[PDB]
């Protein structure tokens with residue numbers, strides 16, 4: 001179109017189709033902002049990394065926007081089923097896929113390169129006096145990537161797994177949690193020793209993944 | 216001002232004006248707008264924060280205008296050091312009510328981001344004669360707990376825990392309370408031995424914390 | 433240099449110049465300034481980070497210039513996989529010293545944001561014959577634990593936890609160590625059965641993590 005100067009209300013403005021200032025070699029192009037340097041301006045792109053979300057809405061002649069937010073880092077997986085875990089964890093099945101009983105499956109997608117997932121499993125469990133084993137398995141692996149231990153005296157108790165896992169890409173990954181007795185015994189999740197409801201209601205165990213940037 | 220044109224600043228031939236209108240812009244640059252290129256011609260893009268980010272513009276002088284990006288404050292911690300005798304029980308009949316156990320803490324928190332969650336962690340040092348411990352988070356204005364967890368003591372003190380995540384509705388400040396009681400059974404001491412004395416003869420510290428996080432759906 | 437005006441770039445009637453001064457600006461665009469609209473005329477506004485935000489200008493380049501906005505690295509994880517016999521106890525007499533229990537780990541962390549906290553969690557696999565486990569976190573320099581927690585083992589391995597919040601006061605490296613021992617009596621094994629055998633025949637992993645957060649000051 002045209003270019004020049006014009007009065008807008010009381011403001012004396014320059015106008016043109018586009019602009020090239022300083023060290024720029026072409027006019028402002030897609031997603032570039034005019035950025036000052038020690039000398040003359042450059043055309044710079046704004047970009048997000050490490051858990052930052054950058055949303056450029058570039059398709060409005062009038063109502064364009066750039067929003068800076070946090071990438072969605074948190075994934076919660078409630079587990080409310082009562083599950084009888086008859087699968088034992090033994091010295092011969094611990095480094096296989098066969099130990100314990102799967103009590104949940106969780107699919108997550110990293111949003112940042114070189115990130116970790118902070119994983120918390122907090123599982124309400126009951127067994128006749130003895131040990132509980134919890135194991136986290138990555139689908140495609142041939143053995144658990146994290147292993148933890150809890151305890152029940154007969155009455156329900158919280159049994160926990162805390163770990164961090166290194167993320168190798170930006171695609172969906174499926175994890176499963178398996179629970180079973182240490183070397184022997186039957187373990188109930190979200191129930192009493194006999195499979196009955198704890199305090200006669202539905203109870204809730206939790207698994208969560210918090211994506212964090214590691215040092 | 217009120218002028219426009221070209222002028223030499225030191226050796227740099229600069230354009231100058233009260234304001235600028237380029238590309239698809241219908242008006243000159245307005246509040247919080249930057250000039251932003253497209254595959255076509257530029258637009259005026261309003262710059263804004265969301266989801267746990269604050270965007271802050273400081274304009275002290277013509278030569279020191281500032282735009283600060285930073286994290287919104289996400290972490291709320293609530294120490295509990297009192298020794299509380301929890302003679303309130305948790306029972307099949309009081310569990311789905313507000314009367315189970317004994318209240319050991321009250322927590323008011325305010326979400327900074329819409330549709331956020333709170334990662335809640337209650338880590339409570341508790342003692343009782345061999346048996347089970349029950350913990351309940353109650354949201355003020357509910358008829359029953361929003362989270363129930365279980366612990367154990369053999370008679371020596373042991374950490375009892377409640378982990379949950381709660382969906383925030385708005386930016387309204389909200390109060391939660393933590394209740395602790397015997398699993399239908401006996402008496403439970405928090406931050407103390409089963410007889411109510413100090414563990415190791417010192418004051419001990421239980422914790423409740425709320426971490427505001429942005430959830431993926 | 434020194435040239436300016438309007439030129440045709442393809443079909444685009446463009447203003448060109450070495451630099452630009454608009455609105456409330458009293459000088460042309462200077463280092464890391466952008467042109468920002470106000471409710472008035474525009475200002476030159478420098479972008480800066482704070483509160484756990486990283487902001488870097490790939491600037492001394494005419495080609496591939498950028499401003500990247502990233503989170504500062506907040507997470508620090510410290511796996512402990514060795515079997516450790518803890519023969520030091522915690523007693524009323526030593527609980528406020530540096531002497532209670534056995535040191536099972538040392539961790540140097542460095543806060544990225546001033547006035548932040550570390551959310552600290554220690555999750556330790558421990559066995560001992562029937563009784564109490566005590567966990568104590570110590571800042572190098574201090575004279576006694578800054579945090580104390582309790583666990584339990586019936587004889588079979590059990591997870592023993594410490595969860596706490598530490599207020600960071602500088603941007604300088606700080607060292608913490610974790611100590612574990614029996615409550616008043618007994619031997620406690622970390623990452624092992626009570627006799628020191630590998631649990632389930634394998635190497636096990638205990639974890640100590642520090643997550644930097646920005647606290648709501650209330």
Ligand code: NA
Pocket residue numbers: 153369586
């Ligand atoms: Na026991």
